[PDB]
């Protein structure tokens, strides 16, 4: 319907795509680095989610330049996506309040 709802939907789909690609790319970037732990896909996908939500427990993280670059993309995609949802909620509340005031 409205632009904000559409944008929020698209952002969520975009995020899921970034989570999957980031998981795949993180493993590709980290294998070959002695000591790295972000090296199998199941846990890499878990890592991508706790990174996108900015929780970052510290159980897993990248040690290489390219793994870190991948991490930044996931971080920004998560922060932006969740932020966009907040903006969509605000727009919805603002429209409803204008109606309620009879504006």
């Amino acid at each position, epitope marked *: 319907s409205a632009l904000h709802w559409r944008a929020a939907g698209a952002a969520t789909v975009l995020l899921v795509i970034v989570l999957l690609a980031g998981s*795949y790319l993180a*493993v590709l970037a980290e294998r070959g*680095a002695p000591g790295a732990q972000l090296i199998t896909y199941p846990r890499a996908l878990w890592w991508s989610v706790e990174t996108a939500t900015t929780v970052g427990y510290g159980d897993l993280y990248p040690v290489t330049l390219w793994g870190r670059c991948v991490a930044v993309v996931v971080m920004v995609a998560g922060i932006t996506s969740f932020g966009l949802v907040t903006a969509a909620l605000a727009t919805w509340f603002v429209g409803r309040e204008q109606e309620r005031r009879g504006h």
Partner: antibody
Amino acid sequence: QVQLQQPGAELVKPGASVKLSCKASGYTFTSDWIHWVKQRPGHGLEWIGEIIPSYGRANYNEKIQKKATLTADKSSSTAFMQLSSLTSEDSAVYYCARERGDGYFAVWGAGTTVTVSS
Amino acid sequence: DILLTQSPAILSVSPGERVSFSCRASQSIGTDIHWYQQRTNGSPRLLIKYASESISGIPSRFSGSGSGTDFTLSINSVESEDIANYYCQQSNRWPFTFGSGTKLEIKR
């Protein structure tokens, strides 16, 4: 059916090189990695390296002298290992194994016995 | 690189008795340990994954346990076909590494 097919043997003259092959069957995923393991007679298993066919990137064991170069042919679903300038120290059984990106070697090839002799 | 220590190198047991193989990691690796069986002239065969997960087609007398640095592969009532070399392998940190292996011998 046999998931990984490797030739039974290869005779190599000292100083020369050889190209081992590992043909894969069964399910193939973008997350699959093909590994190579070396086993000298009477000795244990030694990891040589790995390659991800979907991207073509390979990594190698840093603890040993690099004698191998890994490549893969996506169309023929075959992984290759080029061993160069071999010595008698390189005589052994070389296995290829498939890992689904989750850390363990689910299936192994029969192994190729490489003998370095004149 | 993670060092996996398997000791003793040879384990002797009487037929039907329970036996346990030891694998110790140089640092804590959760449950990222896998076990393989290799008979004379054969290729390694996956027995247990992630320390204790059973694999389809593997006899029920095989089980694994442990976490952190100490792991164990156990065989309930060992039999002739169990005669082989057993290796542990870790996938917690790059690169993957193998233990030196332990041989099982039966006293008949």
